Amino acid sequence: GKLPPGPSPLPVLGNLLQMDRKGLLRSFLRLREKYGDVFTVYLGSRPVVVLCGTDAIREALVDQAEAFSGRGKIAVVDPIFQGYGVIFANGERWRALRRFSLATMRDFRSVEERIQEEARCLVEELRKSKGALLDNTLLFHSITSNIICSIVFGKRFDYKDPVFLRLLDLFFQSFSLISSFSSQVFELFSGFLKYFPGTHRQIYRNLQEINTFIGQSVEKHRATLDPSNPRDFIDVYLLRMEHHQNLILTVLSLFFAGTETTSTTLRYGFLLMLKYPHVTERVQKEIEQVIGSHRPPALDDRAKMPYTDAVIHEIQRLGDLIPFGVPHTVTKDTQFRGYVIPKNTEVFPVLSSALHDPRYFETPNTFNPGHFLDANGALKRNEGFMPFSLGKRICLGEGIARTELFLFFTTILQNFSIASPVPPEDIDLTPRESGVGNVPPSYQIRFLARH
Amino acid sequence: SKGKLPPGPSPLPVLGNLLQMDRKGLLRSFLRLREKYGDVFTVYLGSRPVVVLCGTDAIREALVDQAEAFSGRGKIAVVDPIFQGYGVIFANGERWRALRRFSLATMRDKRSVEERIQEEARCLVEELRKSKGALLDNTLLFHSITSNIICSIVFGKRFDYKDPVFLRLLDLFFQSFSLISSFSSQVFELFSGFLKYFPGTHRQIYRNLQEINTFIGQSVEKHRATLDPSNPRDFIDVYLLRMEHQNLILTVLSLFFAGTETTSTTLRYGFLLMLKYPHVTERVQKEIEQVIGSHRPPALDDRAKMPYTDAVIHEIQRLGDLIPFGVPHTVTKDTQFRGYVIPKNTEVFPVLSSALHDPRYFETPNTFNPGHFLDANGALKRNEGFMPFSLGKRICLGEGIARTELFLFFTTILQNFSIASPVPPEDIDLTPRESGVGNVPPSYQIRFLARH
Amino acid sequence: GKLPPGPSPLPVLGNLLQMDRKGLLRSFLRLREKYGDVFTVYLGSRPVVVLCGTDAIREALVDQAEAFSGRGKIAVVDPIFQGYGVIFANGERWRALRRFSLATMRDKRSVEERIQEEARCLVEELRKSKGALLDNTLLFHSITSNIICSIVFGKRFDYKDPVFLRLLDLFFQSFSLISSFSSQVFELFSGFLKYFPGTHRQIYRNLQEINTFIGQSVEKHRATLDPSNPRDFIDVYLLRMEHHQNLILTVLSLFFAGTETTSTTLRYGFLLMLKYPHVTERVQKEIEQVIGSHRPPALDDRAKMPYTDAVIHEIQRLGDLIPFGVPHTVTKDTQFRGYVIPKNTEVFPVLSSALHDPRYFETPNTFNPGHFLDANGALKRNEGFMPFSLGKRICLGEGIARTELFLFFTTILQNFSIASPVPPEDIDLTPRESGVGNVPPSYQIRFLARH
Amino acid sequence: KGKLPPGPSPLPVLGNLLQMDRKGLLRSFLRLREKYGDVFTVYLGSRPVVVLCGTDAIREALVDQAEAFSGRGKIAVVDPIFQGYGVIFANGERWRALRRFSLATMRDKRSVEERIQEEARCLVEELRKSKGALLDNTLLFHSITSNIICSIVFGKRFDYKDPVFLRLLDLFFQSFSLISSFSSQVFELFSGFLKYFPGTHRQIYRNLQEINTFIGQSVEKHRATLDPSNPRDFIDVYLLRMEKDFHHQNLILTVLSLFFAGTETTSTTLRYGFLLMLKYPHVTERVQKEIEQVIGSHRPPALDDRAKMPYTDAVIHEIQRLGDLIPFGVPHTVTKDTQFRGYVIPKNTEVFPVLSSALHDPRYFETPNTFNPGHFLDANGALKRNEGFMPFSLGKRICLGEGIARTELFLFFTTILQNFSIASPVPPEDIDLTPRESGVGNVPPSYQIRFLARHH
Ligand code: HEM
Ligand code: HEM
Ligand code: HEM
Ligand code: HEM
């Protein structure tokens, strides 16, 4: 039982100076070459244990799922200040949400239908653009947001509805925090980071208006409600409950954060498909063969479209939008691969390192739907595929998201083809911002009706 | 109420008190809470309590009267002996103390800091002539002049303003880069228990790091061969002496540059004020006259004979309020404070902005007013609410070097120049472009016209 | 979410002054009347949560088995001083022992055979006493000890073998620690107790000799031994063998502590049977009807003797030899009957209060085999019967001990009858020492050969 | 650099228990010391305790790092989750107050010295009533020292046969025993819990409520009579503090208990003292002669006499040094990560300051194991300090009773020998001063002695 090996940390800086000018991801890869799949790295004076590769990450998040399932200190209540009670009530709330979330996919109106409706409204908008050159960011935030809106408030919004615009602004609107390296070293010496959520005034711009809107919908909802026949999330909340309107803000927030990842995946997907017209075609042909140019694509179609499915896996794999996964905390002294990780140690499951694992993918860095296709061109599981993560806290939205990706993706290409000022050979898929995320470069595209 | 915890607004699950902030910023938000709950109250960031200290009296009772209890660092800076053993822990203690002590030699002592500043002051005057009265942004200039003081002290000699090592080092330490967030991401961070932002996530930083590091290696060498006690030529060979790992120097340099940046920004703010108040620039120009003539360069001993220029610099620091929430600390033991109890390890914000604007100590908290530091006979007077370097066990290690830079740079500049800008006094706006945890002065233009 | 209610503690003394002249057990009962089945009591400045009644003890030890399974601070390794490693190894050792113990019960000779053999050697000894008045303490320690010797060393000892006498002395020989109330108050104020194991010099009297004997047996064992013929625990140890001998000393220690309880249960059992001769008769008659006076009793007989079984249950229930159970520790913040018990809080499962639960026994305080018999005089389960405790840490020896109690009790009474200077009406079953235990009064008894 | 203190490798469950001698814990610790040095780590169960040996180590810990080594054990630590803070600070204020009230000097209704002097006279009288018979002085010594506390607390001394006083002697001083076996002890270690805890013995409650009641009445009677500024004793000091303002009468029980625990050690010191003096008649004589030269046979000894009697003083020091009644000191707890002699002791580590090892430090006493008044006397026969002398411990928690106790030892000891001489059946060569058990205590063997009136 030794602790995981790693580079020796400096006082105050930890291993900060052992990062490449080439990025955090490369640095992690370099460390991994040196020390192996489980190594320890120091941020400030704090140890974090870093998991790399499909096998290590799956042994941790799946085989010792419970041990590797803790949250960060920011999310741990102090019973000396708040009592137990909020602790247990949060537990129950979480489980209620974890449960209801599953229910939407099983039911039952249905999520597939709401997404189909939304895809229709989308195709219509794309015609209105009459093949002009656009940035799809806003459009893709809109179509994925509405799926949440329909599920929570019961009904989708209109793309130009000023509440829906205000809520797109609250949740998706960037703001930035300015730092310098001298300040960062002083933060490390302090023990405290300068930035924390809500330090930017912008956040509050739209908050109260959104809050108020929620109040109204809870009321309009309460007026008409009948268990055990709950319509949307709002009136499920009312039953469970039977101040707190803020529980809804919180849940909506969580769902929008996943939705942002969903929207960015589509936006990245369409960048890839500009770069690879031949793939756009085989997808157009598989839609022809399976759906025709008549009906809208449906979820049952996916099973009969292994090439479109492989293509979407591959879009999520290279898009790698959450490259360090979400850090967790170990809940107890844990034996792992011949080392010991002490209770409460912070862990990074580096998902990027699975999604690019050379033991699981033939060309880890090259678009290759063949990663998900067998000899007979059927869909095959690949164990390195884990963009929603794994185990006890696997993405709550996996199903909603995978479903949005399929319907929006085929429905768009069934009705349109794409083009841009940039020649395939010259599309650059490398992330503009590569810190803790992999945000796709912004680009222009034109949606031309196949009709 | 035997021993209660400090009162505060009720927190929401996950968000804490995040929705209890104003569209008008944290500082207002805090002041509002203060009105409601008093000088010591509890606020929740995520699920974590932080106890907030407001007003001169509370802040002084904590940081001074219970200095030790209020002296801890945040968790990021606490070593885990399970991972690293004790030893590094005690070594850092010793290193910190050595550095704390070394800070005073500048204080009491081959050539002096005051001298080093005067020399820098001269080079500056020269540079300003070269401007020839053109409009310029003084950011870079002020970073340069204050940075050099640290360079002279550490490497033994100042740099040339266009020396490409010094430009590279200005870039490492002072160059802004930004981290992009959204509100939905932030609420997900709170839910996670972890922040996305942490030092070094921006790739920019490494741009100049290795080059700076190598340069340090070289100076440690050139130092090691020539050097010998007890003739500590500068900080580099003070480090060699103690030592008989270069990265220890990078760390110390880093710390001094962070305080320097605040020093430079204070000057930059100071001059914006002085554009807005020409009448004060004049009384300062006049005081320098009685005191110093127009030929010799100002010296530190002049400060005691210039209460109006002193008071004016206090007042620049007060309103500049560049570290409004102080530096968060941690309580080292269960502590009784003003009728409440703060548990061991609780995080604490000493809100220095609230002492610097304390109505009980400053007649016009929000208005430039040298009278705040002057008595009836226009002599300098202590004001208790004045605490921009903080107080107590961890008072700014640079307080001396900084106060000294501010005096020599401000008087030496005004002795040789006068200032002007496209913007009419009435229209200069001193409100911080962005605050965040900072109160950053709006960028502006200014002209330095040689006096003759 | 409130903590369990209880009496207000004084500084330093805690609730010490809230105890009766009438004893700890009654004091708690008075407290239970006042506060309910779950209450908080202070020893020194430390809270301990006390569980009373069959329902609460079963809801904690069984329904939340894991949460209520922790050990006291004295048994918790500090990884700062010893690393993890010893921690995990002890976990593995414990489970290996937990396992082999169950296996042996299932099993060149069965455990039951070894107890049968020992019952024979006992019967013989009782004849050599030729009906003389004796104190059976030593005899009952001997017969139960040998069962452990045979299992660990492979073969039983001779009752006068001087190794075995030395062994009996180490493990079972009383020594005492002297205290005053003024010293005790000073200990509480100190935060430290004076007593700790091994402060009495007497312990070492026989330790090295015993240790050496173990060495020898490990050797004599290592020479001969081989699967698929493990002869006993010693060579099981050798086999899992794949600083060292002392692991046997430790296990032997543990087994002798439960053995002592077993021996004391027989000794208490025979006291009861002096007091209720008719009961001894019905037992003699059920042995007649079922075993006869020819063969030795066997374990399969027990199923066919519900009266003797019910009478042994009742002996264990009233004997109440471990009335506070063994304190445990709570492993996490726990919800329990409307309260919260914080992580690490010490917990007393007060077994005596189950064994005397008026909700489960008609006459809690009166010998009554009817507690375990139905209308047709068949054996019936009683939920308040838990003298081995319950749940994840139920007595490791439950099976060996129940089997010793049956064969030794029937085998003795099949061959002897009992008598004493004291008239039934005058036998007093109240414990001479009512500390944290319930030690039966010492007495004299004669065994007489039956005919 | 900063490694933990060295020690013997512990076994699972048992810790270092098998590394103890048949020869007792103290010898076991001395053997480890030889092997590992003055600071070493030993394991009780799975719990590390750092052991401090020698005058120098114990003084560097309790004195030079006084605060760091001043913690109490877990039993005495409040969990604020259950009790809040408040009881915690109250206790602090309470400790400090008590500490303060005790620091009044020996002479100032009337002084402690006076009370002791009075008590010595009632003692002398009792020893005459024995008319030189052979007695066991245990009860007598508990009585005389107990009374000092009674006088201080209740305002007046008790009569040696007063049935309240006999009941209180019984509550506080009466032994009871807890029976254990080694197999049970190994199981306790495995459990994580000890069977023994204060109050498991029913005997304690025999006299508790009667004592409590007595305290009630006294408080009331006191309440009736207070004329501060004319405060007679501790009872109305307590009442007075409360007045500025259960915990009510219970705080007194608790304090009384604490004082009787130190009193027991004071009484056992005298009892051990007189056993030594049977063994060394020539020392009894030089003491008798120094009492002659200094006090004469006419007045009662007074405290001011001690300064003028360096031989009696040295003899009493030596009685306390070899008596060694608290050989392991009182275990403490380290309040913070602490650098000590090149090692680190982590926050909350339990510490044994082994006072026996200072009291017998060959570096400070020429003949550590032999009675030798010379340890405290210089060349001219004047008293000299010895650094290894620390039977009340040192530092922030030095015995609260040091003054009262040293004063009782001087007045009782001189007064007795001014008025009596001593004898016993056993010849001095044959007196055996080795303590009966060796387990955290060094109880002197019981013995008989005769007190023979001197008759000037
Ligand atoms: C579009 C692709 C998406 C990806 C790749 C993704 C990925 C993830 C990942 C990596 C996690 C962290 C799992 C862990 O902690 O181990 C996560 C958590 C979560 N995601 Fe998603 N997400 C996506 C979309 C969504 C959507 C649409 C939702 C809608 C609700 C969503 C809701 C959540 C929630 C509530 C969690 C919290 C998991 C927990 O800690 O229990 N995500 N997601
Ligand atoms: C106007 C200029 C400066 C201001 C207003 C300023 C203010 C402060 C403040 C408020 C603190 C935190 C006090 C606390 O935690 O209680 C601090 C800490 C510190 N400052 Fe400055 N500082 C300034 C310049 C400098 C300079 C030039 C240096 C260069 C040597 C410097 C070095 C430090 C150091 C080393 C600390 C750490 C103190 C500690 O934690 O013990 N500061 N400063
Ligand atoms: C009538 C005889 C016995 C009784 C009534 C008895 C009762 C108990 C009880 C009440 C416990 C406490 C369980 C807990 O922690 O909740 C216990 C534990 C234990 N007993 Fe027995 N016992 C008896 C005989 C034995 C015997 C013969 C053995 C021989 C191996 C034995 C070995 C153990 C062991 C190893 C444990 C520890 C269980 C654990 O914590 O994992 N006991 N016993
Ligand atoms: C020869 C007689 C005595 C000896 C040798 C003695 C020795 C000691 C020792 C070794 C300690 C432990 C200090 C520590 O924790 O480090 C102590 C503490 C104490 N003694 Fe005594 N003591 C004696 C008599 C008394 C008497 C007569 C009293 C009566 C009031 C008394 C009251 C106390 C108290 C209250 C403490 C607690 C100190 C604290 O931890 O705050 N002692 N004594």
Phi and psi at residue B351, to the nearest 5°: -80, 90
> Hey, is the C-beta of A261 within 8 angstroms of any chain B C-beta?
no
CA-CA distance, A92 to A127, in Å (whole number)?
46
Question: How distant, in Å, are the alpha carbons of C219, D320, D330, D355, D376 from that of D327?
Answer: 41, 11, 9, 5, 20
Measured from the alpha carbon of residue A148, the closest ligand is 1
Cβ within 8 Å, pair D344-B90: yes
Of residues B283, B367, A91, the one with CA closest to residue C335? A91
The answer to whether A39 and A345 have CB atoms below 8 angstroms apart is no
CA-CA distance, D364 to D390, in Å (whole number)?
12
Helix H segments across D155-249? 163-173, 182-191, 208-225, 234-244
User: Any bridge partners for residue C134, and if so which?
Assistant: C445
Of residues D196, D205, D247, D238, the one with CA closest to residue D220? D238
Determine whether the shortest distance from the Cβ of B324 to ligand 2 is under 6 A.
Answer: no
Smallest Cα distance from B157 to chain A, Å: 21
Q: Using DSSP, how many helices (H) and how many strands (E) does chain B show?
A: 15, 10
* Cα-Cα-Cα-Cα dihedral sign, residues D250, D251, D253, D257: positive
Q: With residue B403 as reference, give the H or E element that holds it.
A: helix B399-416
CB within 8 Å of D162: residues ≥ 6 apart: none
Side chain identity at residue A96, one-letter code: A
CB pairs B-D closer than 8 Å: 39
User: Any bridge partners for residue B48, and if so which?
Assistant: B45
Residues flanking ligand 1, CB < 6 Å:
A 254-255, 258-259, 261-262, 265, 322, 325-326, 387-389, 393-397, 400-401
CA-CA distance, D338 to B292, in Å (whole number)?
54
Which ligand 1 atom lies nearest to the CA of residue A98? 41
User: Any bridge partners for residue A2, and if so which?
Assistant: A339
Residue with the two structure tokens 């650099």: D1
CB within 8 Å of B301: residues ≥ 6 apart: none
Residue B142 in tokens: 């002020």
Of residues C30, C61, C42, C59, the one with CA closest to residue C4? C42
CB pairs A-C closer than 8 Å: 30
CB within 8 Å of A118: residues ≥ 6 apart: A143, A146, A147, A150, A156, A408
* Cα-Cα-Cα-Cα dihedral sign, residues A91, A93, A95, A97: negative
Measured from the alpha carbon of residue A251, the closest ligand is 1
Of residues C377, C383, C397, the one with CA closest to residue C308? C377
Residue C421 in tokens: 């200077």
Shortest-distance Cα residue to atom 24 of ligand 1: A258
CB within 8 Å of C194: residues ≥ 6 apart: C177, C179, C183, C187, D440, D441
Of residues A320, A349, A332, the one with CA closest to residue A55? A349
> Hey, is the C-beta of B443 within 8 angstroms of any chain A C-beta?
no
Instruction: Give all domains of chain C, ordered by start, each with its CATH number.
Output: 1-451 (1.10.630.10)
Task: Report helix, strand or coil for D441.
Answer: coil
String of b and e for C414-440 (b: at least 16 CB within 10 Å)? bbbbeebeeeeeebeeebebbbbbbeb
Pocket probe mutation, ligand 1, options A57, A105, A395, max atoms within 8 Å of Cβ? A395
Residue A54 in tokens: 């499909």
Determine whether the shortest distance from the Cβ of B256 to ligand 2 is under 6 A.
Answer: yes
SS3 for chain C is: CECCCCCCCECCCECHHHCCCCCHHHHHHHHHHHHCCEEEEEECCEEEEEECCHHHHHHHHHHCCCCCCECCHHHCCCHHHHCCCHHHHHHHHHHHHHHHHHHHHHCCCCHHHHHHHHHHHHHHHHHHCCCCEECCHHHHHHHHHHHHHHHHHCCCCCCCCHHHHHHHHHHHCCEEEEECHHHHHHHHHHCCCCCCCCCCHHHHHHHHHHHHHHHHHHHHHHHHCECCECCCHHHHHHHHHCCCCHHHHHHHHHHHHHHHHHHHHHHHHHHHHHHCHHHHHHHHHHHHHHCCCCCCCCHHHHHHCHHHHHHHHHHHHHHCCCCCCCCEECCCCEEECCEEECCCCEEEECHHHHHCCCCCCCCCCCCCHHHHECCCCCECCCCCCCCCCCHHHCCCCHHHHHHHHHHHHHHHHHHEEEECCCCHHHCCCCCCECCCCCECCCCCEEEEECC
CB within 8 Å of A219: residues ≥ 6 apart: none
Q: Chain C residues with CB inside 8 Å of A66's CB?
A: none
Residue D229, preceding peptide bond in cis (omega within 30° of 0): yes
CA-CA distance, A30 to A36, in Å (whole number)?
10
CB within 8 Å of A103: residues ≥ 6 apart: none
The answer to whether B442 and B432 have CB atoms below 8 angstroms apart is yes
CA-CA distance, A13 to A9, in Å (whole number)?
7
Determine whether the shortest distance from the Cβ of C397 to ligand 3 is under 6 A.
Answer: yes
Residue B442 in tokens: 């709006």
**D350 HSE (CA, 13 A, CB side):** 23
Shortest CA distance from D84: residue in chain A: A80
Phi-psi label, residue C295: left if phi above 0, alpha if psi -120 to 50, beta otherwise: beta
- CA A314-A317-A322 angle, to 5 degrees, is 150
Tell me which chains share at least 3 CB pairs under 8 Å with chain D: A, B, C
Smallest Cα distance from A84 to chain C, Å: 6
Task: Report helix, strand or coil for D57.
Answer: helix
> Hey, is the C-beta of D80 within 8 angstroms of any chain A C-beta?
yes
Interface test with chain B among D1, D65, D85, D339, by most B beta carbons within 10 Å: D85
Question: How distant, in Å, are the alpha carbons of A102, D254, D257, D261 from that of C185?
Answer: 59, 7, 6, 8
Tell me which chains share at least 3 CB pairs under 8 Å with chain A: B, C, D
> Hey, is the C-beta of B84 within 8 angstroms of any chain D C-beta?
no
Residue B337 in tokens: 């404070």
User: Any bridge partners for residue D180, and if so which?
Assistant: C175
Of residues C122, C141, C158, the one with CA closest to residue C416? C122
The answer to whether D208 and C17 have CB atoms below 8 angstroms apart is yes
Q: Chain B residues with CB inside 8 Å of C79's CB?
A: 82
**B152 HSE (CA, 13 A, CB side):** 22
The answer to whether C163 and C157 have CB atoms below 8 angstroms apart is yes
Task: Report helix, strand or coil for B65.
Answer: helix
Determine whether the shortest distance from the Cβ of D327 to ligand 4 is under 6 A.
Answer: no
- Give resolution in angstroms: 2.5
CA-CA distance, A384 to C202, in Å (whole number)?
64
CA of C404 relative to ligand 3 center, distance in Å: 14
SS3 for chain A is: CECCCCCCCECCCECHHHCECCEHHHHHHHHHHHHCCEEEEEECCEEEEEECCHHHHHHHHHHCCCCCCECCHHHCCCHHHHCCCHHHHHHHHHHHHHHHHHHHHHCCCCHHHHHHHHHHHHHHHHHHCCCCEECCHHHHHHHHHHHHHHHHHCCCCCCCCHHHHHHHHHHHCEEEEEEEHHHHHHHHHHCCCCCCCCCCHHHHCCHHHHHHHHHHHHHHHHHCCCCCCCCCHHHHHHHHHCCCHHHHHHHHHHHHHHHHHHHHHHHHHHHHHHHCHHHHHHHHHHHHHHCCCCCCCCHHHHHHCHHHHHHHHHHHHHHCCCCCCCCEECCCCEEECCEEECCCCEEEECHHHHHCCCCCCCCCCCCCHHHHECCCCCECCCCCCCCCCCHHHCCCCHHHHHHHHHHHHHHHHHHEEEECCCCHHHCCCCCCECCCCCECCCCCEEEEECC
> Hey, is the C-beta of D190 within 8 angstroms of any chain C C-beta?
yes
Task: Report helix, strand or coil for B448.
Answer: strand
The answer to whether D294 and D305 have CB atoms below 8 angstroms apart is yes
Name the strands in the sheet holding D449-453, side by side, starting at the edge strand that comes first in the sequence: D134-135, D449-453, D420-423
CA-CA distance, A22 to B248, in Å (whole number)?
24
Side chain identity at residue B220, one-letter code: V
Q: Residues of D comprising the binding site for heme?
A: 399
Residue with the two structure tokens 């989708």: A156
CA-CA distance, A146 to A120, in Å (whole number)?
13
DSSP label of D179 = E
Residue A244 in tokens: 């707190």
Residue A354 in tokens: 């699975």
CB within 8 Å of B282: residues ≥ 6 apart: none
Residue B219, preceding peptide bond in cis (omega within 30° of 0): no
Determine whether the shortest distance from the Cβ of C354 to ligand 3 is under 6 A.
Answer: no
Residue D80, classified by CB atoms within 10 Å of its CB into exposed (0-12), middle (13-18) or buried (19+), is: middle
The answer to whether C432 and C442 have CB atoms below 8 angstroms apart is yes
Phi and psi at residue D104, to the nearest 5°: -65, 150
Determine whether the shortest distance from the Cβ of C355 to ligand 3 is under 6 A.
Answer: no
Measured from the alpha carbon of residue B317, the closest ligand is 2
Pocket probe mutation, ligand 4, options D332, D399, D412, max atoms within 8 Å of Cβ? D399
Measured from the alpha carbon of residue B390, the closest ligand is 2
Smallest Cα distance from D6 to chain B, Å: 15
The answer to whether C251 and C152 have CB atoms below 8 angstroms apart is yes
CA of A101 relative to ligand 1 center, distance in Å: 12
Tell me which chains share at least 3 CB pairs under 8 Å with chain B: A, C, D
The answer to whether C323 and C354 have CB atoms below 8 angstroms apart is no
Cβ within 8 Å, pair A342-C79: yes
CA of B403 relative to ligand 2 center, distance in Å: 11
Task: Report helix, strand or coil for D332.
Answer: strand
Of residues C84, C82, C243, C247, the one with CA closest to residue D48? C82
CB within 8 Å of D415: residues ≥ 6 apart: D117, D120, D121, D123, D124, D300, D301
**What's the residue count for chain A?**
451
Q: Chain B residues with CB inside 8 Å of C80's CB?
A: 81-82
Side chain identity at residue A403, one-letter code: T
CA-CA distance, C246 to D12, in Å (whole number)?
9
